[PDB]
């Protein structure tokens, strides 16, 4: 109950500041004020057009590496096992293959951003 209570208060405080910030100040809306900023000149296109991602391969590698750490985060419970040798070999093998995967991608220039 307590965790729910404090997070609601955190939400409540943030939303109150937003309401104050939008209803206290004097406003003056006109078109030139609300147009998008681009260093004093008009944009030549939408900001909604495609924006190329040069690190796209690192990005999807990160998806796999993020499930690798998910497999590592039970380790504090796993070190309590009687089967210490089995746990240790499994953890060593898991870390080593992930290193080999990173090493391969590194030597394939998979960490280099595209030009």
């Amino acid at each position: 109950m307590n965790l729910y209570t404090v997070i609601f208060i955190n939400i409540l405080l943030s939303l109150t500041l937003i309401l104050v910030a939008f209803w206290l100040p004097q406003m003056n809306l006109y078109s030139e004020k609300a147009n998008p900023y681009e260093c004093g000149f008009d944009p030549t296109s939408s900001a909604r057009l495609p924006f190329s991602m040069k690190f796209f391969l690192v990005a999807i590698t990160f998806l796999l590496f993020d499930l690798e750490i998910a497999l590592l985060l039970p380790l504090p419970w796993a070190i309590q096992t009687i089967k210490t040798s089995t746990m240790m070999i499994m953890a060593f093998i898991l870390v080593t293959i992930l290193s080999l995967g990173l090493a391969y991608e590194w030597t394939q220039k998979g960490l280099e951003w595209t030009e």
Binding site: L71, T81, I82, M90
Partner: peptide
């Protein structure tokens, strides 16, 4: 603890 059984 249950998830950690993957290690043992």
């Amino acid at each position: 603890i249950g998830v950690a059984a993957m290690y043992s």
